[PDB]
């Protein structure tokens, strides 16, 4: 099924125009570039087009950083 | 000068005062050097795990009102 939203439909003098179209439809794609916002999300995309948002990169923080213990490497 | 702002050193005439336990600020030491951390429960506290004593000051007055001395938080 398809939803159609057209809230944003407007009649003006100004001649016929198709000044957005938007769908949420995607194909198959390979993994074109990938890279690292500021939030730590890493995002990729594909040939499709999909801006596809990977993950996050987790971060911890500890309230005593002076007495963890020391592992190797 | 180590550029740690946990360390803290006392020119001229004065003692630190720390407490063997947090709930008990009675009974207390006199102490020089300034090599303080935050534990687990975010006081500052020395080498030894013992806590630092400290006043509790005015929201807008800037004098201390009560002398009795308290783990710092």
């Known amino acids: 099924t398809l939803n159609f939203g057209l809230g944003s439909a407007t009649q003006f003098a100004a001649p016929f125009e198709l000044t957005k179209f938007d769908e949420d439809g995607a194909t198959t794609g390979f993994l074109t570039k990938v890279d690292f916002d500021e939030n730590g999300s890493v995002m990729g995309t594909y040939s499709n087009g999909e801006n596809v948002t990977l993950g996050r990169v987790a971060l911890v923080r500890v309230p005593n950083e002076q007495g963890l213990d020391k592992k190797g490497g | ?23 008990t600020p ?18 500052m506290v020395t080498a030894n795990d013992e806590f630092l004593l400290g006043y509790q000051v005015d929201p807008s007055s800037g004098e201390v009102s009560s002398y009795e001395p308290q783990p710092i938080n």
């Open chain 2, 26 to 43: 009675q009974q207390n030491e006199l102490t020089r050097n300034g090599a303080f951390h935050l534990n687990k429960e975010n006081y």
């Open chain 2, 1 to 23: 000068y180590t550029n740690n702002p946990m360390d803290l050193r006392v020119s001229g005439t004065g003692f630190f005062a720390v407490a063997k336990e947090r709930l």
